[PDB]
């Protein structure tokens, strides 16, 4: 091929390998998405940093680590149904997620954003998918004011 032998790492594995995205994996495993991402195909997932979680409040964070339903929910919205990378965009791109809500991704100033959120290090080639490290845990649409 060109560069092999060393080894690879599936989208999920890529996260499992990276410690920064450890606590996240657990979330996936618990949610029961690992397998899904384990099976070949394509799935755009976003793994935030380590402190990205510590930022989360004990109201949302806990819940996540608590209720799985709500957990997978977030993960679902964090996972896509296609590989979207800053390759041939244009202005805006709508990534059909699993949770149901389409993930918004665009390329401006050469910067990638997901749901109006800054990405850490996008363009993460996997074995059967892609990954885009985020600087903070994404959140699904909802009334957040009260």
- CA 23 distance to own-chain centroid: 13
Close Cβ partners of 118 (under 8 Å, ≥ 6 residues apart): 111, 134, 135, 136
Domain assignment of residue 115, given as a range: 1-146
What CATH number corresponds to the domain at position 77?
A: 2.30.180.10
Q: Extract the tokens encoding 28.
A: 């996936």
Q: How far apart are CA 113 and CA 11, in angstroms?
A: 19
Q: Extract the tokens encoding 111.
A: 């910067």
| Nearest residue to 79 via CA among 27, 22, 37 | 37
Half-sphere exposure of 109 (CA within 13 A, CB side): 4
Our count of domains for the chain comes to 1
Q: How far apart are CA 107 and CA 88, in angstroms?
A: 10
Q: Could you write out the DSSP letters of every residue in the chain?
A: --S-SS----HHHHHHH-STTHHHHHHHHHHT-HHHHHSSS--EE----SHHHHHS-TTTHHHHHH-HHHHHHHHHHHBBSS---TTS--S-EEE-BSSSSPEEEEEETTEEEESS-BEEEEEEE-SSSEEEEESS----S-----
Measured from the Cβ of residue 103, the count of other Cβ atoms closer than 10 Å reads: 25
């Amino acid at each position: 091929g060109s560069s092999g032998s060393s080894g690879m790492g599936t989208v999920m594995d890529v996260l499992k390998g990276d410690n920064r995205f450890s606590m996240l994996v657990a979330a996936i495993q618990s949610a029961g998405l690992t397998e899904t991402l384990n099976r070949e195909g394509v799935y755009t997932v976003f793994a935030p940093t380590n402190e990205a979680f510590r930022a989360l409040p004990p109201r949302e964070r806990s819940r996540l680590l608590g209720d799985a339903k709500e957990l997978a929910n977030i993960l679902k919205y964090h996972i896509g149904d296609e590989i979207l990378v800053s390759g041939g965009i244009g202005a805006l791109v709508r990534l059909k997620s699993l949770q149901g809500d389409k993930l918004e991704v665009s390329l401006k100033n050469n910067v990638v954003s997901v749901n109006k959120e800054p990405v850490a290090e996008p363009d993460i080639m996997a074995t059967n998918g892609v990954v885009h490290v985020i600087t903070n845990v994404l959140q699904p649409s909802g009334p957040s004011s009260g």
